[PDB]
Amino acid sequence: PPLSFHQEFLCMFDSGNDGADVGPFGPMYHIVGAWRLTGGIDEETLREALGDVVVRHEALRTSLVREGGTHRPEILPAGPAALEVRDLGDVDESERVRRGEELLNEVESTGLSVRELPLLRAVLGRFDQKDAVLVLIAHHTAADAWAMHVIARDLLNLYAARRGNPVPPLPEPAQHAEFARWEREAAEAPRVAVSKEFWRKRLQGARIIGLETDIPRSAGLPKGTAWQRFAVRGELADAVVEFSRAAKCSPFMTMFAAYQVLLHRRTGELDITVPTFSGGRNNSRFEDTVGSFINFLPLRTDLSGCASFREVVLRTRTTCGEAFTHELPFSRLIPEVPELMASAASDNHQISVFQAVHAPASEGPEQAGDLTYSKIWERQLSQAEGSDIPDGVLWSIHIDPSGSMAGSLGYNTNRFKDETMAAFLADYLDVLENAVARPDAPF
Numbered sequence: 003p004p005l006s007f008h009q010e011f012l013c014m015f016d017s018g019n020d021g022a023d024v025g026p027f028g029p030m031y032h033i034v035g036a037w038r039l040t041g042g043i044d045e046e047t048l049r050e051a052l053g054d055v056v057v058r059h060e061a062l063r064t065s066l067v068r069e070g071g072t073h074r075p076e077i078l079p080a081g082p083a084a085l086e087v088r089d090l091g092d093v094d095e096s097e098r099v100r101r102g103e104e105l106l107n108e109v110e111s112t113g114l115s116v117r118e119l120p121l122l123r124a125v126l127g128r129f130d131q132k133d134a135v136l137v138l139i140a141h142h143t144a145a146d147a148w149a150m151h152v153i154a155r156d157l158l159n160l161y162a163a164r165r166g167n168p169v170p171p172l173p174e175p176a177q178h179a180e181f182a183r184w185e186r187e188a189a190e191a192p193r194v195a196v197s198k199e200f201w202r203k204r205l206q207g208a209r210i211i212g213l214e215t216d217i218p219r220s221a222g223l224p225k226g227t228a229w230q231r232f233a234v235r236g237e238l239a240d241a242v243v244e245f246s247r248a249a250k251c252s253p254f255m256t257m258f259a260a261y262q263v264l265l266h267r268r269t270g271e272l273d274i275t276v277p278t279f280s281g282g283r284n285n286s287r288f289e290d291t292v293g294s295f296i297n298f299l300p301l302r303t304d305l306s307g308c309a310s311f312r313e314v315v316l317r318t319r320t321t322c323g324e325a326f327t328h329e330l331p332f333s334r335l336i337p338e339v340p341e342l343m344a345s346a347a348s349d350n351h352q353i354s355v356f357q358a359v360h361a362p363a364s365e366g367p368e369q370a371g372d373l374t375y376s377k378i379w380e381r382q383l384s385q386a387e388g389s390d391i392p393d394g395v396l397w398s399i400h401i402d403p404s405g406s407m408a409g410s411l412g413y414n415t416n417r418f419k420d421e422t423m424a425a426f427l428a429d430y431l432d433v434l435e436n437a438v439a440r441p442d443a444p445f
């Protein structure tokens with residue numbers, strides 16, 4: 003298979019081939035998922051299920067190897083089924099949550115090479131016979147967040163069937179290579195021309211907003227990515243969810259709008275372009291498919307003349323609607339507007355991305371056979387050296403149906419001080435709070 007458009011996007015953010023094993027085709031560019039498991043576990047059989055999962059999805063066997071400047075995919079035969087198990091200790095709940103977070107951090111702090119199998123690893127942390135945390139980590143070229151939920155769903159299903167516990171049959175998945183074919187086929191349609199023309203004009207003169215770094219690029223400090231984690235307080239999250247319902251906008255639009263307000267106060271800019279990642283899974287043929295589908299999507303909003311936070315949210319809604327309506331794979335949009343990324347590689351600025359995690363919606367614990375499992379979203383333990391961000395700043399929020407929000411601000415430690423970002427995050431939460439408290443107040 004060829005690289006997908008998303009993997010082509012990542013190539014733009016590659017490190018080149020000069021010494022250091024970093025960036026998105028390096029071993030720190032991974033994604034984790036943690037699930038709380040209730041019920042007795044047969045570790046042997048779970049390990050076998052993990053083998054089944056990797057056999058099932060080609061993307062989890064598709065290494066990427068350096069091939070003269072670029073990266074070549076190669077689908078490999080599944081390697082040995084492997085599972086690490088740790089006894090975390092039979093302790094009180096709050097200590098279980100803590101030791102669980104520490105395990106997640108530890109796993110995310112370790113490398114996982116894309117150049118050879120495995121591309122997925124699993125660590126099971128058992129508290130007692132009937133309570134555990136299951137941690138999956140996958141190279142982020144192979145899996146996005148949605149794909150991690152597919153992997154978990156499949157895994158626990160295949161485990162149950164091996165145990166002889168009744169479970170519904172799994173659908174036959176499409177493979178990511180079939181998606182890769184399809185997106186390229188799709189990108190030759192007449193519709194695409196109209197969309198390229200829409201973008202060429204919409205983004206004329208546009209520059210993704212750059213944030214001034216504390217440490218310049220040319221300092222050459224070693225690449226690292228830190229993650230400051232937070233949960234939106236319940237009263238605040240309720241306010242956001244309620245405001246959004248009444249405004250007829252999504253909670254994402256409201257949070258993004260607050261970010262635009264924050265960038266205005268810090269940069270003075272009124273013409274604000276900020277990329278998000280869309281989920282990139284509008285084609286439901288691929289909902290059972292493991293792969294990384296997400297798509298870099300520039301959102302340009304003109305804030306000039308806004309008389310209130312409500313107006314900001316409404317312009318944002320307009321921007322997102324047209325953006326999703328005309329969405330292109332970014333590696334087929336960027337040629338039309340090549341100066342859009344100027345501040346990305348500048349010596350004293352980096353771009354930021356503001357996203358909502360795209361994941362299957364679940365109300366509460368799920369069941370597969372004799373196990374109950376639920377996803378862990380809220381991590382409050384921050385992390386000094388975790389999953390790689392190729393070259394920038396990432397805001398990432400997961401918005402639960404329940405209304406609760408788990409977020410991260412990730413940044414490169416070779417470019418930003420920890421205290422700078424802590425202040426940035428605190429500013430963001432303060433802007434968000436005043437905004438929804440007083441959405442119609444004048445500026």
Ligand SMILES: OC[C@H]1O[C@@](CO)(O[C@H]2O[C@H](CO)[C@@H](O)[C@H](O)[C@H]2O)[C@@H](O)[C@@H]1O
Nearest residue numbers: 033034379381389398399400408409410
């Ligand atoms: O990103 C929101 C929220 O989700 C968690 C849950 O583990 O992290 C996921 O999203 C991060 C950003 O995309 C990834 O780096 C991470 O691998 C993935 O698990 C949080 O820790 C975060 O606050």
Ligand SMILES: OC[C@H](O)c1ccc2ccccc2c1
Nearest residue numbers: 015355391392393394395396
């Ligand atoms: O899930 C998105 C991923 O963490 C990512 C990939 C490329 C980026 C490029 C610039 C800034 C942030 C990025 C984040």
